[PDB]
């Protein structure tokens, strides 16, 4: 972990959660926290945590039947979801911010896609900190890891909390074998999102889900 990041796996990072006043999302997300199948699946891992947490229409498949639950393995059972982008494609190249939006929307939830180029840090910080206080509203961020001092390319993960005192957001990093959840300064996360994803030729950003 680069010195700009506070790992959740530390006394400081636990305390940032205990002193946070915008942390409602942490509880349900922690209950659904999963490991990405692989890097290309970071967005799928992220969507299913949020979709399980929203309690929507879950897939009904053999794996867990009679139980209905979102899983990375069953996420593409939804015919509309497959139509957005082939499962095979996502398994190799991941998904863009717009695709993340469309994939979530395909399960009938309300989604607002926010490219960094269409907003600014003040509005991001403010709107997300609000969201993190509300139940039934989740945020997933899409960012370039290396801009926050992490190893490398574009990533997707849900946000769990905002710490007012330190102006840091908690990223529930689905790459759990690689990194812990991390408390990132809003300015680092902004710079990381304000990057052009070469696959979309568009800026990264964040999605609201309810
Ligand atoms: Ca929320």
UniProtKB/TrEMBL annotation:
UniProt binding sites for Ca(2+) 2: 24, 135
Domain of life: Bacteria
Residue sites binding glutathione per the record: 36, 95, 142, 145, 154, 178, 204
Xref: PROSITE patterns: PCS
Top-level EC class: transferase
Keyword annotations: Cadmium, Calcium, Metal-binding, Signal, Transferase
Residue sites binding Ca(2+) 3 per the record: 25, 131, 134, 137
EC number: 2.3.2.15
Domain Peptidase C83: 1-210
GO molecular function: glutathione gamma-glutamylcysteinyltransferase activity; metal ion binding
Designated name of the protein: glutathione gamma-glutamylcysteinyltransferase
Native source species: Nostoc sp. (strain PCC 7120 / SAG 25.82 / UTEX 2576)
């Amino acid at each position: 972990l680069s010195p700009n990041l506070i790992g959740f796996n530390s006394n400081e990072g636990e305390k940032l959660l205990l002193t946070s006043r915008s942390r409602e999302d942490f509880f349900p997300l922690s209950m659904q926290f999963v490991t990405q199948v692989n890097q290309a699946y970071c967005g799928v891992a992220s969507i299913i945590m949020v979709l399980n947490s929203l309690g929507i229409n879950a897939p009904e498949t053999a794996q867990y039947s009679p139980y209905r639950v979102f899983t990375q393995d069953n996420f593409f059972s939804n015919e509309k979801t497959k139509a957005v982008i082939a499962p095979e494609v996502v398994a190799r190249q991941g998904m863009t911010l717009d695709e993340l939006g469309r994939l979530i929307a395909s399960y009938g939830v309300k989604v607002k896609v926010n490219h960094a180029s269409d907003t600014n840090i003040e509005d991001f910080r403010k709107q997300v900190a609000e969201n993190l206080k509300q139940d039934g509203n989740f945020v997933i961020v899409n960012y370039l890891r290396k801009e926050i001092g992490q190893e490398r390319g574009g990533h997707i993960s849900p946000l769990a909390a905002y710490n007012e005192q330190t102006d840091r957001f908690l990223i529930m990093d689905v790459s759990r074998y690689k990194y812990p959840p991390v408390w990132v300064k809003t300015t680092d996360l902004w710079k990381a999102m304000n990057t052009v994803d070469s696959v979309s030729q568009k800026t990264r950003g964040f999605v609201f889900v309810s």
